[PDB]
Specification:
2 chains; 54 residues; Putative capsid protein (chain A); mainly beta; part of a larger assembly; virus
């Protein structure tokens, strides 16, 4: 392939309570990351036979 | 917020109607706090004379 993936996630929070009260809930969050490969790098050289023989 | 039982709770060691007077028992280990200690430093820094019974 030509892609890679990684995941991300958030954190939580704390609260306080007193007798007779209910408890609240919270929601976590997440995302993702992706990286791609695009370009090739190279070097080249060429020589002629007549120059090679001399 | 409130649970559906808030007004009808049975609370032990709360007196009176509405159960809001605190009559709990204290817990006592035995700790006692008092002033700090000291020891004299100047007793050899003088000339001494005794006049006991004379």
């Amino acid at each position: 392939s030509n892609q890679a993936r990684i995941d991300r996630m958030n954190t939580v929070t704390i609260k306080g309570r007193t007798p007779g009260q209910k408890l609240d809930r919270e929601s976590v969050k997440n995302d993702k990351l992706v990286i791609t490969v695009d370009t090739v790098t190279y070097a080249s050289t060429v020589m002629d036979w007549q120059d090679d023989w001399t | 917020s409130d649970t559906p039982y808030k007004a009808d709770l049975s609370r032990v060691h709360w007196a009176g109607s509405n159960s809001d007077v605190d009559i709990h028992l204290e817990i006592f280990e035995g700790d006692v706090d008092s002033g700090f200690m000291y020891n004299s430093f100047f007793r050899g820094n003088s000339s001494y004379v005794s006049v006991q019974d004379q």
